[PDB]
């Protein structure tokens, strides 16, 4: 038996309830905080949310979220480009 669903609709920031679904994720793989197609789709079920939101999250979230959980102090200022 197979089958599946659709969605289409714009929003902006996910709300806390769901995002600790992501988060709770993004943090034992905080390693890379880069989920699979697998993984955004699964928590798209519990967070219910477009593969594209979820994705798109984990980017600016890897900025704010990844470093805040992380902590990871590189202090790597990449060499300008001067063009």
Known sequence: GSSGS???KRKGNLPAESVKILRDWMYKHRFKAYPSE??????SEKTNLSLLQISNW????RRRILPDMLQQRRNDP???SSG
């Open 78 to 80: 990449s060499g300008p």
């Open 38 to 43: 697998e993984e955004k789709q699964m928590l």
């Open 58 to 61: 984990f980017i600016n979230a």
């Open 6 to 8: 659709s969605g289409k």
